[PDB]
PDB file of C-alpha atoms and ligand atoms in Angstrom:
ATOM      1  CA  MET A   2      18.473  19.774  10.368  1.00 52.32           C
ATOM      2  CA  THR A   3      18.994  15.983  10.389  1.00 51.33           C
ATOM      3  CA  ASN A   4      17.904  14.078   7.295  1.00 51.47           C
ATOM      4  CA  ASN A   5      14.551  12.276   7.379  1.00 56.81           C
ATOM      5  CA  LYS A   6      13.929   9.141   9.474  1.00 51.32           C
ATOM      6  CA  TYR A   7      10.712   8.118   7.713  1.00 47.09           C
ATOM      7  CA  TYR A   8      10.197   9.640   4.248  1.00 45.15           C
ATOM      8  CA  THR A   9      13.456   8.294   2.780  1.00 42.61           C
ATOM      9  CA  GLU A  10      14.314   6.988  -0.653  1.00 44.62           C
ATOM     10  CA  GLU A  11      14.796   3.373   0.558  1.00 44.65           C
ATOM     11  CA  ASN A  12      11.515   3.610   2.530  1.00 46.80           C
ATOM     12  CA  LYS A  13       9.600   5.087  -0.435  1.00 48.30           C
ATOM     13  CA  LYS A  14      10.859   2.166  -2.528  1.00 48.37           C
ATOM     14  CA  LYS A  15       9.734  -0.334   0.121  1.00 48.74           C
ATOM     15  CA  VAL A  16       6.284   1.247   0.377  1.00 48.92           C
ATOM     16  CA  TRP A  17       5.980   1.298  -3.446  1.00 50.16           C
ATOM     17  CA  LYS A  18       6.614  -2.452  -3.643  1.00 49.32           C
ATOM     18  CA  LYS A  19       4.555  -3.397  -0.581  1.00 48.90           C
ATOM     19  CA  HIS A  20       1.704  -1.329  -2.044  1.00 53.07           C
ATOM     20  CA  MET A  21       1.871  -3.476  -5.192  1.00 51.57           C
ATOM     21  CA  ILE A  22       1.544  -6.580  -3.030  1.00 53.18           C
ATOM     22  CA  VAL A  23      -1.486  -5.264  -1.142  1.00 52.49           C
ATOM     23  CA  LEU A  24      -3.131  -3.950  -4.312  1.00 50.18           C
ATOM     24  CA  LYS A  25      -3.335  -7.410  -5.828  1.00 48.49           C
ATOM     25  CA  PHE A  26      -4.961  -8.576  -2.535  1.00 50.12           C
ATOM     26  CA  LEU A  27      -7.561  -5.795  -2.687  1.00 52.91           C
ATOM     27  CA  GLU A  28      -8.736  -7.112  -6.054  1.00 52.64           C
ATOM     28  CA  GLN A  29      -9.646 -10.495  -4.551  1.00 55.17           C
ATOM     29  CA  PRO A  30     -13.366 -11.387  -4.441  1.00 54.32           C
ATOM     30  CA  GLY A  31     -15.088 -10.342  -1.227  1.00 55.85           C
ATOM     31  CA  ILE A  32     -12.102  -8.179  -0.346  1.00 56.32           C
ATOM     32  CA  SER A  33     -12.875  -5.657  -3.081  1.00 56.92           C
ATOM     33  CA  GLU A  34     -16.347  -4.848  -1.823  1.00 55.64           C
ATOM     34  CA  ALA A  35     -15.127  -4.550   1.770  1.00 57.81           C
ATOM     35  CA  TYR A  36     -12.329  -2.174   0.718  1.00 57.99           C
ATOM     36  CA  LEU A  37     -14.932  -0.078  -1.047  1.00 56.77           C
ATOM     37  CA  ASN A  38     -17.297  -0.033   1.938  1.00 56.13           C
ATOM     38  CA  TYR A  39     -14.335   0.873   4.159  1.00 55.91           C
ATOM     39  CA  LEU A  40     -13.379   3.768   1.826  1.00 57.17           C
ATOM     40  CA  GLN A  41     -16.959   5.047   1.906  1.00 56.03           C
ATOM     41  CA  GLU A  42     -16.826   4.979   5.719  1.00 56.96           C
ATOM     42  CA  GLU A  43     -13.366   6.580   5.946  1.00 56.46           C
ATOM     43  CA  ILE A  44     -13.871   9.696   3.822  1.00 55.76           C
ATOM     44  CA  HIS A  45     -16.215  10.824   6.604  1.00 56.00           C
ATOM     45  CA  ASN A  46     -13.492  10.241   9.246  1.00 55.76           C
ATOM     46  CA  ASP A  47     -11.820  13.640   9.784  1.00 57.09           C
ATOM     47  CA  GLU A  48      -8.769  11.854  11.172  1.00 56.38           C
ATOM     48  CA  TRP A  49      -7.393  12.157   7.618  1.00 54.14           C
ATOM     49  CA  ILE A  50      -6.224  15.636   6.604  1.00 57.20           C
ATOM     50  CA  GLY A  51      -4.749  16.392   3.223  1.00 55.49           C
ATOM     51  CA  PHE A  52      -5.757  12.943   1.943  1.00 56.18           C
ATOM     52  CA  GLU A  53      -8.758  14.087  -0.170  1.00 52.69           C
ATOM     53  CA  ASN A  54      -7.321  13.526  -3.655  1.00 54.26           C
ATOM     54  CA  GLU A  55      -6.133  10.052  -2.713  1.00 56.06           C
ATOM     55  CA  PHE A  56      -9.464   9.049  -1.169  1.00 52.27           C
ATOM     56  CA  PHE A  57     -11.223  10.216  -4.301  1.00 52.95           C
ATOM     57  CA  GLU A  58      -8.868   8.377  -6.660  1.00 53.99           C
ATOM     58  CA  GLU A  59      -9.263   5.232  -4.542  1.00 51.87           C
ATOM     59  CA  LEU A  60     -13.054   5.498  -4.394  1.00 52.19           C
ATOM     60  CA  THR A  61     -13.411   6.166  -8.139  1.00 52.89           C
ATOM     61  CA  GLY A  62     -11.032   3.455  -9.337  1.00 51.70           C
ATOM     62  CA  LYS A  63      -8.531   6.003 -10.741  1.00 54.35           C
ATOM     63  CA  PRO A  64      -5.029   4.643 -11.498  1.00 53.31           C
ATOM     64  CA  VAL A  65      -2.708   4.494  -8.448  1.00 55.56           C
ATOM     65  CA  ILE A  66      -0.066   6.619 -10.176  1.00 53.72           C
ATOM     66  CA  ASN A  67      -0.175   9.008 -13.144  1.00 55.66           C
ATOM     67  CA  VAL A  68       1.234   7.953 -16.535  1.00 56.48           C
TER      68      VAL A  68
ATOM     69  CA  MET B   2      10.229  -5.608 -13.526  1.00 57.53           C
ATOM     70  CA  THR B   3      10.030  -1.959 -14.541  1.00 57.62           C
ATOM     71  CA  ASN B   4      12.105   0.829 -16.114  1.00 62.26           C
ATOM     72  CA  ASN B   5      10.987   3.300 -13.359  1.00 58.71           C
ATOM     73  CA  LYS B   6       9.903   6.034 -15.767  1.00 60.39           C
ATOM     74  CA  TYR B   7       6.919   6.866 -13.570  1.00 62.94           C
ATOM     75  CA  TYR B   8       8.877   6.460 -10.332  1.00 61.93           C
ATOM     76  CA  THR B   9       8.547  10.223  -9.733  1.00 64.70           C
ATOM     77  CA  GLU B  10       8.432  12.182  -6.472  1.00 62.68           C
ATOM     78  CA  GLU B  11       4.776  13.155  -6.992  1.00 63.19           C
ATOM     79  CA  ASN B  12       3.801   9.552  -7.586  1.00 65.25           C
ATOM     80  CA  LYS B  13       5.867   8.304  -4.643  1.00 65.18           C
ATOM     81  CA  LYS B  14       4.024  10.764  -2.356  1.00 63.44           C
ATOM     82  CA  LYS B  15       0.720   9.559  -3.777  1.00 62.88           C
ATOM     83  CA  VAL B  16       1.620   5.858  -3.187  1.00 61.11           C
ATOM     84  CA  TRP B  17       2.815   6.751   0.326  1.00 60.70           C
ATOM     85  CA  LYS B  18      -0.563   8.241   1.251  1.00 61.20           C
ATOM     86  CA  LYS B  19      -2.575   5.522  -0.402  1.00 62.68           C
ATOM     87  CA  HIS B  20      -0.604   2.838   1.363  1.00 64.13           C
ATOM     88  CA  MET B  21      -1.434   4.565   4.668  1.00 60.33           C
ATOM     89  CA  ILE B  22      -5.142   4.370   3.744  1.00 61.73           C
ATOM     90  CA  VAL B  23      -4.869   0.676   2.943  1.00 57.79           C
ATOM     91  CA  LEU B  24      -2.818  -0.034   6.070  1.00 52.07           C
ATOM     92  CA  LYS B  25      -5.654   1.167   8.228  1.00 52.16           C
ATOM     93  CA  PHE B  26      -8.031  -1.031   6.190  1.00 48.88           C
ATOM     94  CA  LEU B  27      -5.869  -4.165   6.902  1.00 48.85           C
ATOM     95  CA  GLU B  28      -6.281  -3.670  10.691  1.00 46.26           C
ATOM     96  CA  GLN B  29     -10.013  -4.377  10.449  1.00 47.64           C
ATOM     97  CA  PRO B  30     -11.609  -7.613  11.741  1.00 51.12           C
ATOM     98  CA  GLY B  31     -11.257 -10.542   9.352  1.00 50.66           C
ATOM     99  CA  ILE B  32      -9.083  -8.617   6.894  1.00 51.51           C
ATOM    100  CA  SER B  33      -5.697  -9.100   8.593  1.00 51.48           C
ATOM    101  CA  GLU B  34      -6.246 -12.869   8.651  1.00 53.64           C
ATOM    102  CA  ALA B  35      -7.445 -12.908   5.064  1.00 53.69           C
ATOM    103  CA  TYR B  36      -4.366 -10.895   4.128  1.00 55.35           C
ATOM    104  CA  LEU B  37      -2.033 -13.370   5.842  1.00 56.74           C
ATOM    105  CA  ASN B  38      -3.784 -16.272   4.029  1.00 55.40           C
ATOM    106  CA  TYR B  39      -3.374 -14.390   0.767  1.00 57.58           C
ATOM    107  CA  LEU B  40       0.311 -13.819   1.375  1.00 54.68           C
ATOM    108  CA  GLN B  41       0.773 -17.522   2.215  1.00 55.25           C
ATOM    109  CA  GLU B  42      -0.962 -18.586  -1.028  1.00 57.68           C
ATOM    110  CA  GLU B  43       1.201 -16.004  -2.743  1.00 58.60           C
ATOM    111  CA  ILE B  44       4.729 -16.858  -1.550  1.00 62.97           C
ATOM    112  CA  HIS B  45       5.522 -19.420  -4.248  1.00 64.94           C
ATOM    113  CA  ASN B  46       4.006 -17.422  -7.110  1.00 69.03           C
ATOM    114  CA  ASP B  47       6.611 -16.239  -9.617  1.00 69.30           C
ATOM    115  CA  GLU B  48       4.363 -13.200  -9.817  1.00 68.74           C
ATOM    116  CA  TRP B  49       6.487 -11.723  -7.041  1.00 70.04           C
ATOM    117  CA  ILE B  50       9.927 -12.339  -8.469  1.00 70.29           C
ATOM    118  CA  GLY B  51      12.140  -9.539  -7.124  1.00 68.91           C
ATOM    119  CA  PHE B  52       9.673  -8.886  -4.280  1.00 66.94           C
ATOM    120  CA  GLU B  53      11.252 -11.389  -1.915  1.00 71.94           C
ATOM    121  CA  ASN B  54      12.359  -9.077   0.911  1.00 72.21           C
ATOM    122  CA  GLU B  55       9.160  -7.045   0.969  1.00 70.93           C
ATOM    123  CA  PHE B  56       7.104 -10.177   0.876  1.00 69.48           C
ATOM    124  CA  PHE B  57       9.038 -11.704   3.727  1.00 63.72           C
ATOM    125  CA  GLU B  58       8.799  -8.544   5.887  1.00 62.93           C
ATOM    126  CA  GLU B  59       5.021  -8.514   5.256  1.00 61.26           C
ATOM    127  CA  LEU B  60       4.594 -12.207   6.046  1.00 60.56           C
ATOM    128  CA  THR B  61       6.673 -11.959   9.265  1.00 61.59           C
ATOM    129  CA  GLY B  62       5.033  -8.732  10.466  1.00 54.82           C
ATOM    130  CA  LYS B  63       8.318  -6.783  10.215  1.00 54.65           C
ATOM    131  CA  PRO B  64       7.802  -3.001  10.041  1.00 52.48           C
ATOM    132  CA  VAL B  65       6.385  -1.369   6.932  1.00 52.54           C
ATOM    133  CA  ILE B  66       9.308   1.027   6.846  1.00 53.00           C
ATOM    134  CA  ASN B  67      12.707   1.281   8.438  1.00 54.25           C
ATOM    135  CA  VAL B  68      13.136   4.064  10.977  1.00 56.32           C
ATOM    136  CA  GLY B  69      16.734   3.043  11.661  1.00 56.79           C
TER     137      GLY B  69
HETATM  138 NI1  LIG C   1     -18.459  13.489   5.704  1.00 54.54          NI
HETATM  139 NI1  LIG C   2       8.968 -20.560  -3.640  1.00 54.75          NI
END
């Protein structure tokens, strides 16, 4: 069974760093409130499956990572 | 700038999912533009030293990840 195309070490590193970039953006004024309102809207979208812990941590201001 | 002590598989999976959540937020009206503005203000900030490639891929709309 071929090795992963998507969830790869290089790609996990790239997402880690790009997530740092976006995270500083989310803390900007105006943007913060909109991210929050978006998160409140999205937890009720059943398009996401298996994402419950992450939505909660995001909604409650929990640290991104543990540690 | 990090020793990668918390760069663990569990945390990588967590950051993966969260970044998917945020990615859908960026596609909303207004937010993509605001994000590009932010990145433009941000390019010459020595806050992102060592982030150059990621920053550039983000600014030029290059894919989030590399399929191959
Ligand atoms: Ni609901
Ligand atoms: Ni510069």
